[PDB]
Every structure is written in C-alpha cells, then in structure tokens.
C-alpha cells in the first residue's frame, strides 16, 4: 500500500547526485517513521540518515536514530549490523537508552535470552513502537539453531526461545522445517551434510593444465 | 604551514575537472592539441586523478581540523567527482576502473561501502596494476567488517599474485607497492590471527620465519590474554582511515580529535568482538565424538560452575559458526574434518618461471639490438 | 625363486606358513634373505608383523626396475598390470580387427590397393626422367 | 601429443569395429558368435579391477611428479639462462 509510493521517493531521487543536500532527510526520518509503523525496509537510505550525522554533527536527531539500530537488529542475523553500529559516533552514545539498546546488540550474537526476553526493561514504547519485533528477531533465533541441533526437548527448547507455551511453539514450528519426534526431539536436517570433506581426493583436471601442456607438448 | 601552495596548485587544475569534463569536453579540441605538441610527459590523466587523490587527502585532514562541516576539499572531492566521472559519453581511455575506485574509494573514507557486487557487474575495460592492488584491499577489509570471512581467504587470496615484472620507469606505482604489500599480508595473517585456523592461504604463499611473528600473535589469542584485542586493533590503526599530515596542532581545544572520535574510539570495541569467536574456537577439535556423559564431562573440564553450564556453554559455541547436531538417547556429537589441501604451487611455479624465462629474454633480446 | 613364485599368486600369507615351509633354514636366516630380494630385484614383498603376516603386491606406487628375473611366469601383480594397461587396449582391439572380418572397411581396403597400384603405373617415367635431369644436376652442382 | 591424441584416434577407428558389430551380433548376427564372444569377454577381463580412490593416490601424486620435474627443469633453465645473461657481459 503505502510501501510502494515511498520506495519511488527513495528509490528514484535518493540513486544520485542529491545526497549531499540534507534536504532529502525530511522525507528520510519520515522513513524512519515508515518501517516503525509498517515494517518497511531500505537499508542504504537507513545508512543514508546515519551518513548526514558524522559529516554534519549539527543536525543529530534523538528519536530517529534509536529506533534504527534496534531495526537493524531486525536486519540480524545479516552481518550488515557491524557497519551501522560503529557509524554513529561516540559522542552520541553517552545518553539513554542508546547504553541500553547497544548494549543489545552485544547480548544476541553470543546468544543471551534471559534478559533479552526475562529480565527486559519494557518501559519503552518504541519495542511495541515497531511492528512485529518478537517475529523478526526470533526469524533471526530460529534460523540460528537450525544449524547447531539435530536433537533437543521442547521443554529446553522454549525455555532459550523465551517462555512461550506449546499452544504457539508448534505453529512457529510449522514455519520453519522443524517436525516434533516425540519426546523431544526435533527434526531439522540429516547428518551428512556437515562432516564438510574439503577432501584428499581434490584433483587436477585435463584442462586445468593443458595451459602449460601446450608449450613444452 | 609551507602545505597552503601545494593544494592551490594542484585544486585550480581539479576546479577544472569537473567543469572541462562534465559539461564541455566532448568535442573540446584545442586542448588536445595542446598536449600532445607542447609537453615530454604522456601519463597526466593518470597522474591528474591519483596524484590528486594523494595531495586532498593532504588536505582532508587540514581542511577537517579547520572546518568541520562542509569542508573545501571535502567540497571539491567528494560533491563533484561522482556524477562528473562515470556518466558521460564515452571516454576512451585507462580510466574505467581508475574511476570507480576513487567513486568507491570516496565512499570509504566514510565507513558506508555496501555496494560490492553492483561495482563488480559494471565493467567493459581492461584493468590497471595500480587498480588491482587498491580494489582487493579495499573489498577485502570491507569483508574484514561486513564478515565474510569463509571469502575472505578468496578476496586476499587474489591480491598476492605477486609478478611484479618491474616497471619503475618513474616511479609509476605511485610510492604504493612496498607499504601496502606490506598492508594485504599483514590482514591476511590477522585474518590467521581472527579466524583460527583456517587459512592455510599465507602456508603456501610465503615463508615461515614471517608467519612466527604473528605465530607469537595468535597463540596470545587461545586462552588468556586482554591485549589479543589491542593487537589486532592497533596493528589496524594505521590502516582505517590512514591520516597523513597535519598543518596546525593546537590543543588547547584540539579541534582535531572530535573526528578521531567519529572513527576511532567506536571502532575500537567492534575489535573486543573480534577474539571472541577465537574464545568460542578457543577448543580446537582433539576431541569430537562423545557420549552424553562427555558432553556433561565436556562442561566440567572446560571449567566450573558445571550445571547449569549449558547456558554459557551455548555461549561458548554459537558466535557464528559451529555446525555439530547432538543426540540425547545416545549422545552422540557430530565430527567436521579438517582435511589437507594439495600442492597446486607446482603447477603455478611452472607460470612463475616460463613468465621470467621468456620474459628474461623478452627484454633483454632487445637489449642484443640495443648495444650491439 | 619361490619368493618369486608365490608373489605372482598370493596376497596375503602369514610368516608362520611359510617358516614351515622351507625345513633347511631358521626364521632369522630367512628374514633377511627375504629383504635383500626385495629392494634389489624387483620383487614385491611386504612384511608385517602385527598379524605376523606377509603382503605380495597390494603397493600401487611402484615403478618397476629393468633388471629382474623374468623367470617361470605367471599374471603378474597387478603393479605391473595398472601400468601397461592401455597397451591390452590397443593389442587385442587390433587383433578383434581380424575376428569381425568387417565387410565395408574391406572394401576401402582394396580400393586404396587399387588406386595405389595403378598410382605407380600412371607416374612411372616421370621421376626416372627427372632423377636422370637430378643426376645431371650433381655433374654441374659438384662442379659448381 | 598429436600422436598421443592420435592413439586415441587409432583405439577410436579400432572402437568403432567391434562396436558397430556389437550391435549386430547383439541382434541377429550370431552365426559365428562364439570365436568373437570368447576374445570380447577376455579383453575385458585382461584389465584389472581398483576402486577409484586407489587410482589417484597412483595419478595425481605421479601428476605432481611430472609437474615438479615441469618447474624444476625450467628452474635449472633459468638459472642456465640467467647465467648466460651474467657470463656474457
């Protein structure tokens, strides 16, 4: 619906030479405004309002640049994360809650959920602010086990997925491959794949030499 | 001082690149006739962009700690060259990657290089020396950042194909070969010293005396040591934005770190991440097939405060990488090789040496009809 | 001579066996007259002594020397049969050249006997004549 | 390597006959079918039998002899030549 429209204004004025004119970040923090409310996404344009910061310190905004890196924690597991989280300056990251929210970043890689789903201060409305952050950042979490389990119990299993019930943790998991073999393990790929033989057996082929078999002959 | 000339010379000529270029220079022809009657030096237009590459960011760094926002070389690099440099009819000229890589290389004193696969699609011109050594490096410590790592043995492989054939012949690298051959390694053994162990691509290029001094680096990293963070970060240091010269050092406010502020400091603690996979790939695999008893006896010798241990013992396995699934009936863990490579070398050194023998006597045939 | 005689049939047989069989010597005697005609002399001869037993062949690096007894014969181990293998290829497919006696390549035969034949009959007189106008042509080069 | 490439050439006229009688002794043609099927069968089995991952340890480590004696010759050879670019000074 309204996602359409404004990819034109990002997508056809924000490609070229008006991007060291500060006059497209009233549309751009308004982009900020369009993926809190319907979950839009345009990253380099996200970038783009963190550009205009740290080469004009003179137009820093509080509430826009907040709530991008906790959307871009949204844009998790995709390494993308690492760019933007150093591109706001220091000088920027003395208030609060930014301590509070870069501090988040720090938790999830290394794979923290006790305060991330337990003991989370929620007295911030910009988490509900956003739309559909608990489906984005276990999208995150579901992809990320997936590699490490073949075997785990749906006892252990939701208490690191933050303590939702069996009533939903079967419909998530009609999402993403994963079938329950009772009792309690859960189904998730074979075992051959990821022996990983970069094997002994690699070879040299006819043409990979024939470059040089050519000239001595 | 004694710097202010040393721009203005060379600024009233880059004045004119984006005004001669851009808007007139499709069917100028009396300055043609200019250079090819009046001057003994053919290779200007690869001097009138990369020596002004190297005299601007003389002055990003005295323009910046005199002006903040908005600056003049900033103004004259950065808010003229893009659009002036690709879009025109065409130039046929070496400029068509030499282009790009200031366009890039203009978007990377600035940290936000996103745009590595549209750069790669866009090319019909052969490629520079010069371009080949600044484009692996520049794509390759964007990987270093954006973090891929499992191509990052194929970006830094491709830079250290190592012919040189030597063509100095005035100075034509320009100062550029020794310093930053010496840079492409020296990341390459830190990507030895972040990733351990896997490359095995410095093993079969170079010797073993070099790689035992990182080998005193990355055996700092396995247990226990705070400075594996600082070497890693201070031996970059030179290499994230390279500043080269201040004109005026005042301190008393100093006016020139508030932009050290805006890299520097923030970069820093993205390198305390860095070895903390190393901590994660802190067991390298001498044992990795075990009972449900040796997963739990896997918690206790790794240390203490065993159970619950698997709260942080997911913590000591999951940064990115670790691939084993793990049974709960039998108890069984998984086994990933790691598994040789072989001598492709010796079919590259056959090209290293039917290169040199030819062109050994591609060169020095000429001297036969040179001298005698 | 037997070394050379059981190599060419057996694989693996254990020390054990054949300590009885030759009755005229002690183990220790033949232990080292085993090795010396196996590193000179071209035979295949391992020995392990875990499940103390013999291996004939079972070595595919090996590059056979020229000075070995070719002695009373039998398939050889399979050393000297992965090398020269392209060679059964290329005898036996000419020798099943005859065993078809194809009827089309036959007559391809013929007509290039035939048209080589007469080829002679149409050119003869022609270089005779101009060997001839060659021999005079040394009496005036080796003058020359 | 021309007559290398031509040996295949001669197993490929040679391939070429007992094929093109193989689908006709295959069919009909089975008068005399026995004095060919004896000397096919044993051209097949005059050849010995390796799984192939015995065969590379045997070829691509005899490859990476023949590619070493490949840059040690042109080793010498520019080191011969290098030579002669000192000594004829």
């Not at chain 2, 240091?237 to 508030?258: G, M, R, T, W």
């Not at chain 3, 007259?33 to 875990?50: G, N, P």
Request: hydrophobic content about 40%.
């Amino acid at each position: 619906a309204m996602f359409e429209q404004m990819r034109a204004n990002v997508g056809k004025l924000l490609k070229g030479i008006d991007r060291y004119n500060p006059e497209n970040l009233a549309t751009l923090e308004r982009y900020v405004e369009t993926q809190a409310k319907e979950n839009a996404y345009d990253l380099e344009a996200n970038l783009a309002v963190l550009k205009l910061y740290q080469f004009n310190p003179a137009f820093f905004q509080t509430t826009v640049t907040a709530q991008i890196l906790l959307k871009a924690l949204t844009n998790l597991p995709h390494t993308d994360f690492t760019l933007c989280k150093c591109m706001i300056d220091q000088a920027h990251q003395e208030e609060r809650p930014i301590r509070q929210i870069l501090y988040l970043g720090d938790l999830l890689e290394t794979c923290h959920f006790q305060a991330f789903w337990q003991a989370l201060d929620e007295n911030m409305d910009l988490l509900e602010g956003i739309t559909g952050f608990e489906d984005s950042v276990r999208k995150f979490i579901c992809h990320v086990v997936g590699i490490t389990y073949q075997h785990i119990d749906r006892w252990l299993l939701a208490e690191m997925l933050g303590d939702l019930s069996d009533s939903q943790l079967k419909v998530w998991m009609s999402k993403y491959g994963w079938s329950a073999d009772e009792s309690g393990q859960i189904f998730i790929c074979s075992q051959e794949e990821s022996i990983k033989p970069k094997n002994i057996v690699e070879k040299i082929d006819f043409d990979s030499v024939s470059s040089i078999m050519a000239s001595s002959q | 001082q004694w710097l202010w000339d040393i721009i203005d010379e060379f600024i009233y000529q880059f004045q004119s690149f984006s005004q001669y270029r851009c808007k007139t220079a499709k069917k100028s022809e009396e300055e043609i006739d200019f250079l090819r009657s009046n001057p003994k030096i053919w290779n200007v237009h690869s001097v009138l962009n990369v020596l002004h590459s190297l005299v601007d960011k003389s002055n990003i760094n005295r323009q910046l700690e005199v002006y903040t926002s908005g600056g003049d070389p900033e103004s004259v690099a950065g808010e003229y060259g893009r659009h002036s440099l690709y879009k025109m009819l065409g130039y046929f000229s070496l400029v068509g990657l030499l282009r790009l890589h200031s366009l890039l290389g203009d978007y990377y004193q600035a940290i936000k290089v996103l745009e590595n696969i549209e750069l790669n699609k866009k090319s019909m011109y052969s490629r520079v020396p010069e371009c080949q050594v600044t484009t692996y490096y520049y794509v390759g410590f964007a990987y270093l950042m954006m973090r891929r790592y499992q191509d990052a043995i194929r970006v830094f492989a491709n830079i250290l194909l190592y012919i040189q054939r030597t063509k100095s012949m005035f100075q034509r690298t320009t100062y550029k070969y020794e310093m930053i051959n010496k840079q492409n390694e020296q990341m390459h053994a830190l990507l030895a010293i972040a990733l351990t162990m896997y490359p095995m691509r410095i093993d079969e290029s170079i010797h073993l005396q070099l790689r035992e001094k990182y080998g005193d680096k990355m055996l700092r990293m396995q247990k226990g040591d705070p400075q594996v963070y600082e070497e890693l970060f201070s031996y970059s240091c030179p290499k994230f934005l390279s500043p080269v010269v201040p004109n005026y050092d005042n301190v008393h406010p100093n006016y020139h770190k508030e932009p050290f502020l805006q890299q520097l400091k923030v970069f820093s603690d993205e390198v305390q991440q860095q070895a903390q996979l190393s901590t994660i790939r802190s067991f390298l695999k001498l044992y990795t097939t075990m009972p449900v008893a040796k997963l739990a006896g896997f918690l206790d010798l790794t240390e203490q405060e065993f159970r619950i241990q698997l709260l942080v013992f997911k913590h000591k396995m999951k940064n990115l990488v670790w691939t084993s699934g793990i049974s709960a009936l039998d108890g069984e863990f998984q086994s990933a090789s790691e598994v040789d490579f072989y001598i492709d070398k010796d079919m590259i050194h056959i090209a290293d040496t039917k290169v040199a023998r030819r062109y050994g006597d591609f060169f020095i045939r000429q001297i036969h009809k040179f001298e005698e | 001579r037997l070394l050379q005689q059981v190599s060419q049939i057996y694989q693996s047989i254990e020390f054990s066996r054949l300590t009885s069989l030759v009755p005229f010597v002690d183990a220790f005697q033949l232990e080292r007259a085993i090795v010396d005609a196996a590193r000179h002399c071209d035979l295949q001869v391992r020995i392990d002594h875990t499940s103390r037993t013999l291996s004939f062949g079972s070595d595919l690096n090996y590059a056979t020397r020229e000075d070995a007894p070719i002695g009373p014969h039998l398939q050889s181990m399979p050393s000297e049969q992965i090398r020269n293998q392209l060679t059964a290829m290329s005898s036996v497919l000419a020798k099943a050249l005859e065993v078809i006696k194809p009827a089309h390549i036959l007559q391809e035969k013929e007509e290039q006997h035939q048209l080589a034949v007469t080829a002679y009959l149409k050119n003869s007189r022609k270089e005779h004549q101009r060997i001839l106008a060659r021999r005079q042509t040394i009496e005036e080069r080796k003058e020359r | 390597l021309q007559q290398v490439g031509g040996a295949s050439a001669r197993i490929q006229d040679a391939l070429s006959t007992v094929l093109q009688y193989a689908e006709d002794v295959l069919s009909g043609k089975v008068s005399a079918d026995n004095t060919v099927g004896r000397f096919l069968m044993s051209l097949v089995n005059q050849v010995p039998k390796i799984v192939p991952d015995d065969f590379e340890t045997m070829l691509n480590s005899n490859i990476n002899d023949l590619l070493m004696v490949t840059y040690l010759a042109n080793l010498t050879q520019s080191q011969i030549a290098l030579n002669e670019k000192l000594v004829n000074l």
